[PDB]
Scaffold this motif. Structure first.
Motif, mmCIF file in Angstrom:
data_model
loop_
_atom_site.group_PDB
_atom_site.id
_atom_site.type_symbol
_atom_site.label_atom_id
_atom_site.label_comp_id
_atom_site.label_asym_id
_atom_site.label_seq_id
_atom_site.Cartn_x
_atom_site.Cartn_y
_atom_site.Cartn_z
ATOM 1 N N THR A 168 0.844 -1.221 0.082
ATOM 2 C CA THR A 168 -0.067 0.027 0.111
ATOM 3 C C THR A 168 0.878 1.218 0.012
ATOM 4 O O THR A 168 0.300 2.426 0.020
ATOM 5 C CB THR A 168 -0.797 -0.004 1.275
ATOM 6 N N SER A 169 2.199 1.191 0.103
ATOM 7 C CA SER A 169 3.108 2.199 0.377
ATOM 8 C C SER A 169 2.978 3.130 -1.147
ATOM 9 O O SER A 169 2.349 4.332 -1.304
ATOM 10 C CB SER A 169 4.475 2.075 0.345
ATOM 11 N N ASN A 170 3.631 2.603 -2.176
ATOM 12 C CA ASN A 170 3.587 3.423 -3.383
ATOM 13 C C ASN A 170 2.239 3.082 -4.064
ATOM 14 O O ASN A 170 2.046 1.771 -4.071
ATOM 15 C CB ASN A 170 4.754 3.079 -4.306
ATOM 16 N N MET A 171 1.427 3.659 -4.332
ATOM 17 C CA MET A 171 0.028 3.709 -4.805
ATOM 18 C C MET A 171 0.470 2.748 -6.242
ATOM 19 O O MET A 171 -0.363 2.110 -6.595
ATOM 20 C CB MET A 171 -0.641 5.128 -5.348
ATOM 21 N N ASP A 172 1.360 3.193 -6.881
ATOM 22 C CA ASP A 172 1.563 2.840 -8.285
ATOM 23 C C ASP A 172 2.410 1.223 -8.179
ATOM 24 O O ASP A 172 2.039 0.311 -8.968
ATOM 25 C CB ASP A 172 2.882 3.582 -8.935
ATOM 26 N N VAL A 173 3.078 1.120 -7.207
ATOM 27 C CA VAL A 173 3.395 -0.469 -6.870
ATOM 28 C C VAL A 173 2.285 -1.200 -6.609
ATOM 29 O O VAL A 173 2.300 -2.346 -6.909
ATOM 30 C CB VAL A 173 4.611 -0.312 -5.795
ATOM 31 N N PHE A 174 1.580 -0.628 -5.674
ATOM 32 C CA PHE A 174 0.204 -1.495 -5.372
ATOM 33 C C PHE A 174 -0.836 -1.688 -6.748
ATOM 34 O O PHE A 174 -1.113 -2.712 -6.786
ATOM 35 C CB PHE A 174 -0.746 -0.340 -4.423
ATOM 36 N N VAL A 175 -0.861 -0.571 -7.396
ATOM 37 C CA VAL A 175 -1.745 -0.604 -8.714
ATOM 38 C C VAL A 175 -1.095 -1.903 -9.731
ATOM 39 O O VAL A 175 -1.737 -2.433 -10.266
ATOM 40 C CB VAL A 175 -2.023 0.495 -9.394
ATOM 41 N N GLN A 176 0.156 -1.560 -9.841
ATOM 42 C CA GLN A 176 0.961 -2.760 -10.776
ATOM 43 C C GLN A 176 0.762 -4.198 -10.114
ATOM 44 O O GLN A 176 0.615 -4.963 -10.689
ATOM 45 C CB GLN A 176 2.177 -2.321 -10.898
ATOM 46 N N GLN A 177 0.870 -4.336 -8.859
ATOM 47 C CA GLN A 177 0.758 -5.400 -8.173
ATOM 48 C C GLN A 177 -0.662 -6.152 -8.188
ATOM 49 O O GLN A 177 -0.758 -7.309 -8.547
ATOM 50 C CB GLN A 177 1.344 -5.648 -6.648
ATOM 51 N N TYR A 178 -1.607 -5.171 -8.093
ATOM 52 C CA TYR A 178 -3.022 -5.557 -8.293
ATOM 53 C C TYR A 178 -3.138 -6.044 -9.688
ATOM 54 O O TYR A 178 -3.952 -7.207 -10.224
ATOM 55 C CB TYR A 178 -3.938 -4.309 -8.210
ATOM 56 N N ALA A 179 -2.852 -5.418 -10.662
ATOM 57 C CA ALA A 179 -2.926 -5.683 -12.212
ATOM 58 C C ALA A 179 -2.216 -7.068 -12.477
ATOM 59 O O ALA A 179 -2.974 -7.821 -13.238
ATOM 60 C CB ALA A 179 -2.741 -4.571 -13.107
#
Length: 188
Positions: A168-179
């Motif tokens: 949940t830290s980097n919004m972008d790392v989160f989004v990439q992991q989700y996708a």
């Protein structure tokens, strides 16, 4: 391993027959759903990585917002029936949560009118049995995955995305992991 049951995703005890390949549930009343769609762009990022021949499906839910919540599920059915999801998603989210100028079924309709959908065309869809079954489909799907909260995403009727087991830290790392997790589940 890299992707683990109980971590990035969970497994439905009762797999759903004939489910959409990628099924997202949301509400235009849901603050986290506003974040998911308008700030994180989860759907869009998921779709950019989906395999050839995999379609993403998105359903609205009734349990937030009472009468207006159900109006929104019905309007989302109208959007699906007319194929105008990409023209009303942003103004419906902003109308409910940002400006809060959406307080009645009529205010929802205004969004469609303003986006270029003919009044006659909206009204005919709104009152149609095709839209009634689309509303029932959305409700049925919620029951089938034993839905407890939104936002939520299910893959091949077997797996549930578990964002609380991602970073949940980097919004972008989160989004990439989700996708990336949706794509992994899609091929599983």
């Amino acid at each position: 391993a890299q992707y683990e049951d109980g971590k990035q995703y969970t497994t439905l005890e009762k797999p759903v027959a004939g489910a959409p390949q990628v099924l997202e549930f949301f509400s235009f009343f849901c603050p986290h759903c506003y974040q998911f769609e308008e700030v994180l762009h989860i759907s869009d990022n998921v779709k950019k990585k989906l395999p050839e021949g995999v379609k993403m499906t998105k359903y609205h839910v009734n349990f937030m917002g009472g009468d207006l919540g159900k109006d929104l599920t019905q309007a989302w059915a109208v959007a699906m029936a007319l194929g105008v999801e990409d023209k009303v998603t942003v103004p419906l989210f902003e109308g409910v949560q940002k400006t809060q100028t959406i307080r009645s079924a009529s205010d929802i309709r205004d969004v469609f009118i303003n986006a270029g959908i003919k009044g006659e065309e909206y009204d005919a869809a709104w009152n149609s049995f095709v839209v009634k079954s689309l509303v029932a489909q959305q409700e049925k799907a919620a029951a089938d995955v034993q839905l407890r909260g939104v936002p939520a995403m299910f893959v091949n009727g077997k797996y549930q995305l578990n964002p609380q087991g991602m970073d949940t830290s980097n919004m972008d790392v989160f989004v990439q992991q989700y996708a990336d997790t949706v794509k992994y589940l899609s091929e599983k």
